[PDB]
Amino acid sequence: AMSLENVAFNVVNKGHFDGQQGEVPVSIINNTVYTKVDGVDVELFENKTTLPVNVAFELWAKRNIKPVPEVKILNNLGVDIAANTVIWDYKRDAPAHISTIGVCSMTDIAKKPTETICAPLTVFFDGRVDGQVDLFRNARNGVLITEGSVKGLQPSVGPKQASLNGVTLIGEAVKTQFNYYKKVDGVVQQLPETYFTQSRNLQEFKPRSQMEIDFLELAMDEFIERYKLEGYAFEHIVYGDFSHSQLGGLHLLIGLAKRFKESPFELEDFIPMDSTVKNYFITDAQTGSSKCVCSVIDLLLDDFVEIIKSQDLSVVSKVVKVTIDYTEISFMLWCKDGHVETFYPKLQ
Amino acid sequence: AMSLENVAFNVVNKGHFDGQQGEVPVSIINNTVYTKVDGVDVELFENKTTLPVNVAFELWAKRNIKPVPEVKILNNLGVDIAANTVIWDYKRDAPAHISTIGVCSMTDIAKKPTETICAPLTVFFDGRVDGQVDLFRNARNGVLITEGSVKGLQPSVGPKQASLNGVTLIGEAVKTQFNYYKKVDGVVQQLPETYFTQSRNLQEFKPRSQMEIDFLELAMDEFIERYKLEGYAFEHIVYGDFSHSQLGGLHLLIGLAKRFKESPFELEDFIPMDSTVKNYFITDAQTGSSKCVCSVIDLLLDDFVEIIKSQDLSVVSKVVKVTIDYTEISFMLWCKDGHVETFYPKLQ
Amino acid sequence: AMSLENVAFNVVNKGHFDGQQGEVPVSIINNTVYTKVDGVDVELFENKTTLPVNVAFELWAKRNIKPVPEVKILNNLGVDIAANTVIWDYKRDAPAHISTIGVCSMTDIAKKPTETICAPLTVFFDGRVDGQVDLFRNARNGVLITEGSVKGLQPSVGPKQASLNGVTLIGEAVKTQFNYYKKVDGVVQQLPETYFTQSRNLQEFKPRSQMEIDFLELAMDEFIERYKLEGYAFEHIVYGDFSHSQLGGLHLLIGLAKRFKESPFELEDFIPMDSTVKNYFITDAQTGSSKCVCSVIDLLLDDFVEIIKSQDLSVVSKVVKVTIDYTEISFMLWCKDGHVETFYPKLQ
Amino acid sequence: AMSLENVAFNVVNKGHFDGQQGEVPVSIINNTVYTKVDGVDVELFENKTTLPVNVAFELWAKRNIKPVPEVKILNNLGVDIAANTVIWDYKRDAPAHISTIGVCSMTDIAKKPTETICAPLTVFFDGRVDGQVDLFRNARNGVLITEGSVKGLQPSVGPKQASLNGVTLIGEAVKTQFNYYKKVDGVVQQLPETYFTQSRNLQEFKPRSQMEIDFLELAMDEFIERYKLEGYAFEHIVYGDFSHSQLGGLHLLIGLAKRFKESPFELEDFIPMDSTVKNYFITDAQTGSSKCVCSVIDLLLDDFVEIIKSQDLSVVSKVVKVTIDYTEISFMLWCKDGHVETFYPKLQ
Amino acid sequence: AMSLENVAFNVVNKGHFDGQQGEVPVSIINNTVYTKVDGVDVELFENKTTLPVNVAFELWAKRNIKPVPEVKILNNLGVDIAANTVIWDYKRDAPAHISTIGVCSMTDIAKKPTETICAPLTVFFDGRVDGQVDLFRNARNGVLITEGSVKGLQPSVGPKQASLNGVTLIGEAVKTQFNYYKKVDGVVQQLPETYFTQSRNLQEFKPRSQMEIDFLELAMDEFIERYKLEGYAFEHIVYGDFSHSQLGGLHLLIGLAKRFKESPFELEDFIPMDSTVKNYFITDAQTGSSKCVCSVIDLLLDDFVEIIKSQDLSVVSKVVKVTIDYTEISFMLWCKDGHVETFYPKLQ
């Protein structure tokens, strides 16, 4: 017996939908859900989605509260829909997926992923839930996560981090590193060898290697000397050039982190979604150097160094393809006289 | 001559409603009030309430700008309505009470609290306003605050802190510690002996006793030794256990404050109102330990220590009732072999 | 071929309107613009203006992304409208001006500023754009900025700072200090000699003179002694008096900055627009001292000292007029026995 | 080059989307689309759909303006989606189908019905459009209408009436009677024998047989005698019984039409959609006789008489199934002593 | 003392704004204004304009309640703004003009039409209001109506009809036929000779000449014979041709009125504004004959006959220009062998 008032009862009493019986009085006004506590209205939910307020409220209440893959990983693997859960996208304040399976009468296209409507969709399955590995084996199209071996299925070791109630973290009390599997058109697909983005924020950035500690602590010239980076244009690509009206380079999050400690800047996140590569309109507060589309990726600096040192430096310009978060990220590499001029995630 | 434009004139010229004459041009669009300053619209108010935008604007403009009791105290004393003022609830961005007396033509049930409609309501009276102690004596149901003695009325000394324009503070330039009195059904009611919550935030938490300084400065084992807390399960209740998927204990704000200095965590305030006990959906960023309903109370640690050491430790489970902010807070106490296992504000 | 979908294409691909060809799918719901990225809606813009959502979106996308004068300067110079650009007011999240010239089919009153409808409007012209100095010479009413000499036009050297994508800054990689010129009724107007406000925030306040370093570092009595300020009431005007229920003085931002480092306070910006003088409803957290209308100006302390020491101290009360940001700011000066009692921006 | 402004231009200049180049200025406010005509706003569209206002506007503009099957026919034949058109549902003021093919970038799941996502969907094909008969021949699942014979397919002769811009009519200047063909999983179906509803209104009801002429002109007793309808309870079922608090019978639109000529009544259309059977909350103004759910069907009276005279009258109650508008309509037939008591579309 | 509550008081007590003192309690929710009557909310106004709800409410309340020129007349004469009144546009449910003079603080650009901002605007002046003839005499740009002669100005005799509270009528108890005068750049214009539209409705159409009486009463062939209209294609242009899928002709309202008596049709008013020529998407219910853009004008039939009989019938196609309601209306005239084929208001 699903009901708005039952969803609200669960949110008030359990902090999320927990299948408990009960009802509280609700008022809906515009995109806000309220409940009456002792004669006054208390806000339970503000709809930021393109769904109806009461529907969004239910999907949010029914959000997966276990560690789940970051939405950028799901998107990069082509996930269309989840089996019997909601992956809440905390970057969009909205469901990661438009439709559901066995969650909500307004958004369900099916009660179970075995229904024929689901066959052409890439369904996300969670091996931590009884039955879902089997549903994956039966599905035409899917992505599966597990905490361990699945007999006969060749695994891909995923990122260390996952999202737990919108907090990206490397679990200590809980497991966040999953095996991944994918099927297309009834056929298990070998996932590519990949780097993973580190999913750090500017404000709480922490180095995760001696090389990153050195980059944050050393001055530019000593770091470049110590790690033999002469001719790799880290002065432009990583450290950034704030000397002209157009901000030069600055494509690695650690480089933004180092600048940020010294002087503040504005990052306008003009397409605010989770993605392997982020684009910001950056305005440097100290200098007034700015750039409308500054592509930024959070690679471990050691991974970026491995990538750039792996490149042939003998052509003027070429597209370099690097597998990151399971997706092919195109970089533009510009060279002159066997040194790098710039290397950036290629703007589409 | 009350008018939207007159309310707006007061907000622009006086920073709140101050009974001054004058008008400014206003535009209302959706839930926002704007005024025209030199040919452009400037936002004066965004309605977050369930009232009409123009009505909410007026109540907010007419908010009490003296120190007033925190809404949790008023709610715990059963206050329904205020005499000739608006207690603005800065935690809900809304009026603390649905109706008014002598404030606003849309929300007034009466011009004066002596009207018979008010008799069954618990009316909040403010002895700092001429006439209101007398109105309390005449009222069937009420709560009264004063800065001093009321002849023949036995006082209750309230919390040290009050709310001044949404800032909870212990007044130095102004008095925030009131005498409280309550009447039910025409009869003055003896208020119970009570502890008071300290109303601190995680971000700006300051200790208020040598014991709290010690808790914040010492390591866990030395604090527990120094204050003879062996067998009282402070390791679970106060310090918190982040070792399992479900976060253990962590029910005292000071304990959250100590953790917060070391590593960040998310507190989802899923019923965002003022209350003696708060419930959060907590996600620890470092460990991934989490709990959907983590009850948190900000007691002076000395008061909590007094409370828990006062308990008989010889039953498995029992409900312990403690008067806090004038209300009966139920705690669950779980013991084994004469030591505490856990002691938490009982989830309803 | 202007279109909502073309505006959205530019925002997604270029971070702002850049005249590029292309379209993306858009959804408008309430005041929010979304675009479809891989089957889900991503928010591009939330309308906070009194214009239609799609119109506001276009003006914002077409915002000037060069350093431009702070809106308070434009307003103080009487600017009504801009030639062929949008000055976005980041303090109001709205266009600085109601109408446009050659920007947007819904808001344009003209395609070019030479149209007769523009003659009575003070049009903002930007000498960094080809043709606009000539348009200024032809305009009946206008304000012109340039980076250099305009033959025969007597310049006014403007503030050091300008606004670049809502960041107020003194440019190092870009020029933010302009020459200003104004015309009224076909006649070039001599701009007055003026001080300029420094446009600092409380949170990131930095001193810009030895005197400001001294004010922030010294104790009150040594600062006043060192700078010979006995009898100028800096104890009240600058440092502020938190000893009574009404907060005394505190009219200079540097004084708020010094207090802020010690103890937090609330500033309610109840008319949130850019202005030379700002009015706050201030609540001091430590003391409970408050003031409904606290006028605050960010003058270099040396400029304020020059201003107050320039005054005749022999009348009880008088209005003192000071040109600041090109506008006449009225101050009330109250004296007793040849010493200052108070000196504040006069509340209108 | 698809664009809100281009859709608006077509609506203003062509009365609907007609693929013309051009732009008009548009404003969107709440669910309304306006265009500027000589400096004032003129309403073009009010969104009554659950889609975004600008999307609904485009699908409306792109509505099919030829006679098309009534939505109830399409729904009954299981049509999911239309090939390269929008069937506008004028009963719901909304698109008949969730998704589109080759119409609108926000709603399209495909550009052509040959794409694999369309294979499981019952696609509507219109033989009046070049290529669509052949697309039906290649489609796995579809419904096809034609004005004439299709080589190698036996037709089902459809209703005489079709919908032209929300006007249901029997064409004299245009053809409204289609051949129907349907395919499920690649197999041409033999559509069942069916009656058709007549799609008439109460206010402009016209008889379409001599029996209907006689029913409207004669008194009940004369009509029942002429057509030998003794014992078939037409007094109840068709004429209606307004003698008790609950209105008896009245399940045939012609009987509502007859009452309506004599005295008015209220029909609350509480599920306002196109359906073979309609349910109304009916209140008779003359008598006060009412019924919460009065099922009403517009059958030619001769067809209804054929149906009721083709039943076995020997059981107290049973379900009678009748193919109408290609769907199975359940009636309840209640009999006593070999005569009808009532017969109504089953409220199930 | 202008105020939302005072406007509401006037609406409740005087049926419109009448300058009376008083206040009622108001609530604004979305675009609706309500007032409280004995504890319940009663709707006073639903905003259909692009202005803020409270502003639209005031301009509506302050509407001109005397007979005033139809908006199409004012628009055709180039009126920008009205002197000290609001011409309410009942076709758009919105003010006829963007701005006001001496009406409303939000919309006023001036208090008096003598202010310099009004000099370039064509201001509407009403000689029925003391002082306005003289204000017209002093105005650079205006239109003036009067009931009688103005010393030294030759009048243009206007239409017989005017709008009184959105009812277009020819006054018997009040004067609706005005003298018109217009000034451009300080010079009294000689207004052109003009026909006038008759502003009639389909539902209450009344003939205003013996020719119109005859057109309504006689069969097409008798009428055409009586008035010698052979070869002028009235069969097509006026009577309409419902024989083909595209509805032929039907451009004269009297011909729609005649059809409408026999059989109903749908007229979609897809640009719902007052204009000399109206465009309808017409669907004939009897035949299914339809046309996306059917231009319709309500000329006295005698005037239309004079116009068509005053053209040269010797070319295949040309533009015929006719002054109607003071504006230049373009018709397309198509001829063959010296007879008319069609003649219609040009869809341009």
Residue numbers in the entry:
A (entry chain A), B (entry chain A), C (entry chain A), D (entry chain B), E (entry chain B): -1 to 346
Paper passage:
The NSP15 endoribonuclease enzyme, known as NendoU, is highly conserved and plays a critical role in the ability of the virus to evade the immune system. NendoU is a three-domain 34 kDa protein that was demonstrated to form a barrel-shaped hexamer in solution by the assembly of two trimers. The oligomerization is mostly driven by the contacts of the N-terminal (ND) and the middle (MD) domains, while the C-terminal domain (CD) carries the canonical catalytic residues from the endonuclease family. In terms of substrate specificity, NendoU of the coronaviruses is described to cleave a great variety of single- and double-stranded RNAs in an Mn2+-dependent reaction, by hydrolyzing the 3′ end of pyrimidines, with a strong preference for uracil, and to release 2′,3′-cyclic phosphate and 5′-hydroxyl ends as products.
Here we report the results obtained during the fragment screening campaign against NSP15 NendoU. Over 1200 crystals were soaked with different fragment compounds or nucleoside analogs, resulting in 997 datasets collected and processed, with an average resolution of 2.2 Å. Despite the high concentration of ligands used for soaking (100 mM), as well as the large amount and high quality of crystallographic data, only 26 crystal complexes of fragments or nucleosides (2.5%) with NendoU were obtained, highlighting the difficulties in identifying fragments for this crystal system, probably related to the large solvent content in the crystal unit cell (74%).
